[PDB]
């Protein structure tokens, strides 16, 4: 079974680019991060910062998570992110995503020792 921290890395980290450079970014990344294997994951955000910078959020601003848990943290800085969401043309096995690039604060839930991100809650 994949660890929670490793699942977060796979689903949400893309430190190899500064930003989505095209409309096809999400189609490509959703496929390659194995988020379309058996069904199309409906919504998923990638963060274009170093892993260290995203881990560091777990010692930044403590805020409520949407679900009411208290282990969420909001980045002090905005970060380069890309939201990927299925479009109306999407139909497994031919998933199709809209790519929306933005610079926003991220909110992550953190757990463990080391205390690291395990869920992507939202951007602001
Ligand atoms: Cl997400």
Swiss-Prot record:
**Primary location class:** secreted
Q: Which residues are glycosylated?
A: 1, 7, 34, 37, 41
- EC number(s) stated in the UniProt entry for this protein: 4.6.1.18
On the tree of life, the source organism's domain of life is: Eukaryota
Regarding tissue, the record states: Pancreas.
Report the top EC class in one word: lyase
| Subcellular compartments | Secreted
Q: What reaction(s) does this enzyme catalyze?
A: an [RNA] containing cytidine + H2O = an [RNA]-3'-cytidine-3'-phosphate + a 5'-hydroxy-ribonucleotide-3'-[RNA]; an [RNA] containing uridine + H2O = an [RNA]-3'-uridine-3'-phosphate + a 5'-hydroxy-ribonucleotide-3'-[RNA]
Binding-site residues, substrate: 7, 10, 41-45, 66, 85
Tell me, what does this protein do in biology?
Endonuclease that catalyzes the cleavage of RNA on the 3' side of pyrimidine nucleotides. Acts on single-stranded and double-stranded RNA.
Q: What is this protein called?
A: Ribonuclease pancreatic
* Gene this chain is encoded by: RNASE1
What range of the full-length protein does this chain span? 27 to 150 of 150
């Amino acid at each position: 079974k994949e660890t929670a921290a490793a699942k977060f890395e796979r689903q949400h980290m893309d430190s190899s680019t500064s930003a989505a450079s095209s409309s096809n970014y999400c189609n490509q990344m959703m496929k390659s991060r194995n988020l379309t294997k058996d069904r199309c994951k409906p919504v998923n955000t990638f963060v274009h910062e170093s892993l260290a910078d995203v881990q560091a959020v777990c010692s930044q601003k403590n805020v409520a998570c949407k679900n009411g848990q208290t282990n969420c943290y909001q980045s002090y800085s905005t970060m380069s992110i890309t939201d990927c969401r299925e479009t109306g043309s999407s139909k497994y096995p031919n998933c199709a995503y809209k790519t929306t690039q933005a610079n926003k604060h991220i909110i992550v839930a953190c757990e463990g020792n080391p205390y690291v991100p395990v869920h992507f809650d939202a951007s602001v």
